C-alpha cells in the first residue's frame, strides 16, 4: 500500500495560540508530506535495488527508508498527541494511570514537565523530545532521538518535535517558550491509551 | 573568553535574499548562544580537569564541540557573504578560484547545481561546504552536521542549512533559499582562504 | 596530575580460563595504556590550544579526549568489577541489594543475565554492555557505548568489554562463551558498592 | 538470495602477511555472518513492507546497513589482496593508477606511509580506503566505521581494520599489520578499479 499523509483529527488552526495555523498548515502539509513522498519512493528504490541484487544500492537507499520512515512515523503520532483545550488538551487528569506513573517516578506531574522541558531544550540540532515505555504500564522514561529518528526497542507514549519548523515561525528562537507553551495542548488522553497499550 | 563578531556589513545588506530579521535573530540570538555556551563549556573542562575529573571532562567534550563547531561555523558564514553592490555573487572577483572550480566540475554553473543538490540533500540541520586541501590545492564539495565545523581541510566557503537560516523568509522552500544565496556570496573573502588554504 | 595506568587487583592469570592471562596482560599492558597515553596527549594539546585562544583545534581534539579518556574510564572500571572465582567473583550473592532490585527488574537473576547477553550480543562494531542505575539504589538498566564512549547521565553498576580484543585470543568469533563465561568473574561486591553509591 | 563468494586463492596463499588461521575465520565465520545477517534483515524488510508495517521497516534497515555493508566491504577486500606470485604488490602493474597516486602524494612511498598512519588513527572497527571520484579521477584516502561501505565515491582498495583481521597474528600491534599488507594488496585489481571509478 501507498502511504499517505494521515488527515490532522483537528482544524489547522486548533491548537492556537500555542501553535500556529501557518505552522500547522506547514508542517503538515509541506513537511510531513514531504517524508510519505520521500518514504515511498525510498521503499520502492530498495525494492528495484533489492530486484536486481545491487547490495551497494540496498545499502545507500537504508538512510532514506530511515529518514523519510522515521518522519512519517513520528509526525503521525505528534499529530494524535495534540489537542485543542477543548478536546482534552492539557487535560492531565483524562490520563490517571499514565499521571500516576509519571508522580511516581518524577515526584509530579510539574517536576516531570521541567525535566521534559529540560531535555527538549538539550537537544543539539534537530530532534525529539519523548515520553516512553517499555511495555503496558511498565517504566517510564524521557529519550531523544536525532533528526527523524523514531522511538526503538520501547512504546512511545507522546512526543514532542523540537526541529525548528515546528515553532520559529511563531516563537523564533525561543524554544523554551514552546516548550513551556505545547503542555496547553498535550492530548493527554491518547497519551493515557499507549502508556496502558504499551505497544513497542 | 569569547564573544560574538560584528557583522562585516549592515543587518539588511543582504537583502532581499536574507532578510533583515533573519540576520539579526541568526547573529545575535543564535551565533551569540554558541558563544555563550563556548565559553561556560571551555570553563567546565579546565576546572575539570583541575580536579583530575575524567568523566566531567568528557561530558563537557559535547559542549565544546557543539557550541565550538557554531562559533566557527558562523564566524566564517558572515565573512563569506557580502551585499551585492560590495562584490556579493561576484565570482570574477576570485579568478584563482574561478578557474579552480572550472576545472573541478567543468563550469562555475556545474559547480552551483553540485552545491545546491548537496546543500538540498542534507538532513536535518547541518552545513554545506566548498573546501580545497591545501593552498589552491584540490576542491571538493562535503557537509557537516549540527554544528560539526570543517575538519582536516580548509573551508573556502560555507552555507548554513540550519532551517533557523532561512525560515521566516522562504519558509519551506529551502530551494529558493539555496538558489538566492549565490548572489550575496563574498568570493573575494573565498579566493583568500583559498589561496591561503589554512586547515 | 599525569594520568598512570592502575595496576589491576588480581594476577593477570587469576581470571583463567574465563580470561586468559595473555589477553590481561596485552588489554591492560598495551590498550588500557595505550588509552592513558592518549589521554594525556589529548589534554594537553587541549591547553595549549586553549591557551592559543584556538576554536578549531580545542574541537578537533575532543575527539582525542573523548575516544581516550572513555577508554580510560571504561577499562578502569572493568578491571575493577571482575575478580577471581575465589574472590567472590560470580558470586551474585554478595550483591545482596543488587541482586533484589535486579530481581525485581527482571524477575530474577537468569532472567536479567540473558537480557544482559542479548544486548551484548548485538553490539555492532566495537562497544560496551553497561548495567546502570540513575542513582543511589535506584532504578536499573542495561545500556550500551560506542567504541569507548564512558557511561553518562548515570551511575555504571558493572560493564563488559566487548571489543574483539577483550576475547579474540581465547574465544575467537565466539563471542557468544566470551559473554556466557565472564559472568564467571564479575565482581558482584565492587558492583554492589557501586549501586548503593549510584553515582554519576 | 546472497552466498559467500570463494576466496581467490589457497586461505594460506597470503602468508606469512596474513595466517591462514585467520583468513579461514575472517573469511568462513565474520563474512558468512554477515552474508547470513543480510539475507535475514532484507526478508524481515520485505515482509515489514507487505505488512505496512514502517516501525518494522525502518528498525531493520540498520541491519541491512551492517550486514550489506559487511558483504560488500569484504567481498572487496578479498579480490584487493593477492600472493606475491600472483601480483600481490605489484605496483607497477597498476600503472595509472600509480601515475595518479605519485602525482598526489609526492612518491608511492609517501602515500603507504599517510595510508598506514589513516588506518592506525581508526578509533574502534572501521575499514581504511582509498577512493577516487571517477574514472581515472582525483585520489583520496579515507575511512569508514564498522561495516558501513564506501558512498559517494569508487573503492579503489581497502585494508580492514577490525581486530579479527589481525589480532591472532598481530596481537595489538595493527602498524606491523599495515606494513606488511602491503605485500599483499591486488595491485591489478586497483588499477582496474580506478579506471572504472564506479561508484559503489
Ligand atoms: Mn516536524
Ligand atoms: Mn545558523
Ligand atoms: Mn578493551
Ligand atoms: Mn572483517
Same mark, same amino acid.
Given at each position: 500500500?501507498?502511504?499517505?499523509?494521515? /488527515?490532522?483529527?483537528?482544524? %489547522?488552526? !486548533?491548537?492556537?495560540?500555542?501553535?500556529?495555523?501557518?505552522?500547522?498548515?506547514?508542517?503538515? +502539509?509541506?513537511?510531513?508530506?514531504?517524508?510519505?513522498?520521500?518514504?515511498?519512493?525510498?521503499?520502492?528504490?530498495?525494492?528495484?535495488?533489492? @530486484?536486481? =541484487?545491487?547490495?551497494?544500492?540496498?545499502?545507500?537507499?537504508?538512510?532514506?527508508?530511515?529518514?523519510?520512515?522515521?518522519?512519517?512515523?513520528?509526525?503521525?503520532?505528534?499529530?494524535?498527541?495534540?489537542?485543542?483545550?477543548?478536546?482534552?488538551?492539557?487535560?492531565?487528569?483524562?490520563?490517571? #494511570?499514565?499521571?500516576?506513573?509519571? @508522580?511516581?517516578?518524577?515526584?509530579?506531574?510539574?517536576?516531570?514537565?521541567?525535566?521534559?522541558? =529540560?531535555?527538549?531544550?538539550?537537544?543539539?540540532?534537530?530532534?525529539?523530545?519523548?515520553?516512553?515505555?517499555?511495555? /503496558? +504500564?511498565?517504566?517510564?522514561?524521557?529519550?531523544?532521538?536525532?533528526?527523524?529518528?523514531?522511538?526503538?526497542?520501547? !512504546?512511545? #507514549?507522546?512526543?514532542?518535535?523540537?526541529?525548528?519548523?515546528? %515553532?520559529?515561525?511563531?516563537?523564533?528562537?525561543?524554544?523554551?517558550? %514552546? !516548550?513551556?507553551?505545547?503542555?496547553? #495542548?498535550?492530548?493527554?488522553?491518547?497519551? @493515557?491509551?499507549?502508556?496502558?497499550?504499551?505497544?513497542?
Amino acid at each position: 500500500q501507498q502511504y499517505t499523509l494521515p /488527515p490532522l483529527p483537528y482544524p %489547522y488552526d !486548533a491548537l492556537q495560540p500555542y501553535i500556529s495555523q501557518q505552522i500547522m498548515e506547514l508542517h503538515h +502539509k509541506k513537511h510531513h508530506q514531504t517524508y510519505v513522498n520521500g518514504l515511498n519512493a525510498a521503499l520502492e528504490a530498495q525494492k528495484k535495488a533489492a @530486484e536486481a =541484487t545491487d547490495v551497494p544500492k540496498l545499502v545507500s537507499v537504508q538512510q532514506a527508508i530511515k529518514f523519510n520512515g522515521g518522519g512519517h512515523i513520528n509526525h503521525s503520532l505528534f499529530w494524535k498527541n495534540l489537542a485543542p483545550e477543548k478536546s482534552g488538551g492539557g487535560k492531565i487528569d483524562q490520563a490517571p #494511570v499514565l499521571k500516576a506513573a509519571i @508522580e511516581q517516578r518524577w515526584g509530579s506531574f510539574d517536576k516531570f514537565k521541567d525535566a521534559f522541558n =529540560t531535555t527538549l531544550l538539550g537537544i543539539q540540532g534537530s530532534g525529539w523530545g519523548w515520553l516512553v515505555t517499555d511495555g /503496558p +504500564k511498565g517504566k517510564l522514561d524521557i529519550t531523544t532521538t536525532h533528526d527523524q529518528d523514531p522511538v526503538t526497542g520501547a !512504546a512511545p #507514549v507522546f512526543g514532542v518535535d523540537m526541529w525548528e519548523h515546528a %515553532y520559529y515561525l511563531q516563537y523564533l528562537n525561543d524554544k523554551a517558550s %514552546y !516548550a513551556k507553551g505545547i503542555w496547553n #495542548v498535550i492530548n493527554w488522553a491518547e497519551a @493515557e491509551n499507549r502508556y496502558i497499550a504499551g505497544d513497542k
